[PDB]
Ligand binder design. Structure first.
Ligand SMILES: [Cl-]
Length: 295
């Protein structure tokens, strides 16, 4: 059975005049493990993975600005904004070296931070991550029409802001197993107020698809280029059929990325953590152990 509870004391830190919430558990010494969620989730997505890692490592899991229990300033919530606030978050906790565990838009943040801070990243575990999507044919068929509608301002905002489709529709459709009502309520909580749903709409409009938006495409291409030339230890989780990362792409990346271990979690779409948390957690913990082995 998969846990529905969120048994983590809230921690808060001031970041650029706002307050961000984060999970902070595990020993106080050693290399911390920073967990970064994406759209439309929160640190909640890591709730059943962290317990595998916390016995040996500090686990830090922030809620992105505008999401989870973090503050909700009147921003456009561009990727730029998230980058700014996450940089400031990392510096506010005085983190030096880290291991990254990243997912979805959290992966874009993680890879972009790593590229710019290569000496401070001691390993990256990732799953269903942001890469350039050259054309719409390389976006999953079943979600193609939806995300094309998301990527408009009248109808997309109607769907995502007014009707909360990303939470009620897209979110559970990103999990093979059914989310329980308790789980749904945790994911719903930060967005009960419609006006707070801005990040949920901007994020799919920031996705690097078919060359647009060009700035994001460029940035993502840059950190993928960096990732392909980096010797940093890498752990890739993938599922079938996946969403951002289909099996063929995972198979390619497992070989093209230096020093990369790949793990098949079985059936999965986007929120792999919700379909097979125990395997992901366990493999991350053991893989973390292997990072201390010289060979
Ligand atoms: Cl998105």
């Amino acid at each position: 059975e998969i846990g529905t509870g969120f048994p983590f004391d809230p921690h808060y830190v001031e970041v650029l005049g706002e307050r961000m919430h984060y999970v902070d558990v595990g020993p106080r010494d050693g290399t911390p493990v920073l967990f970064l969620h994406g759209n439309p989730t929160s640190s909640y997505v890591w709730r059943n993975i962290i317990p595998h890692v916390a016995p040996t490592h500090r686990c830090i899991a922030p809620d992105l600005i505008g999401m989870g229990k973090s503050d909700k300033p009147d921003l456009g919530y561009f990727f730029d904004d998230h980058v700014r606030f996450m940089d400031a978050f990392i510096e506010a906790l005085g983190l030096e070296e880290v291991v990254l565990v990243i997912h979805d838009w959290g992966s874009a943040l993680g890879f972009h931070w790593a590229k710019r801070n290569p000496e401070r990243v001691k390993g990256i575990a990732f799953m269903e991550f942001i890469r350039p999507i050259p054309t719409w044919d390389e976006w999953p068929e079943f979600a193609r029409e939806t995300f094309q509608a998301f990527r408009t301002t009248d109808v997309g905002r109607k769907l995502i802001i007014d009707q909360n489709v990303f939470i009620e529709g897209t979110l559970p459709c990103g999990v093979v197993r059914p989310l329980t009502e308790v789980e749904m309520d945790h994911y719903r909580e930060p967005f009960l107020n419609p006006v707070d749903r801005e990040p949920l709409w901007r994020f799919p409009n920031e996705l690097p698809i078919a060359g647009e938006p060009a700035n994001i495409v460029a940035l993502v291409e840059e950190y993928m280029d960096w990732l392909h030339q980096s010797p940093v230890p890498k752990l890739l989780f993938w599922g079938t059929p996946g969403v951002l990362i289909p099996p063929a792409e995972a198979a390619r990346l497992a070989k093209s990325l230096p020093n990369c271990k790949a793990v098949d979690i079985g059936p999965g779409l986007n929120l792999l953590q919700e379909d097979n948390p125990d395997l992901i957690g366990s493999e991350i913990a053991r893989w973390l152990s292997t990072l201390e082995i010289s060979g």
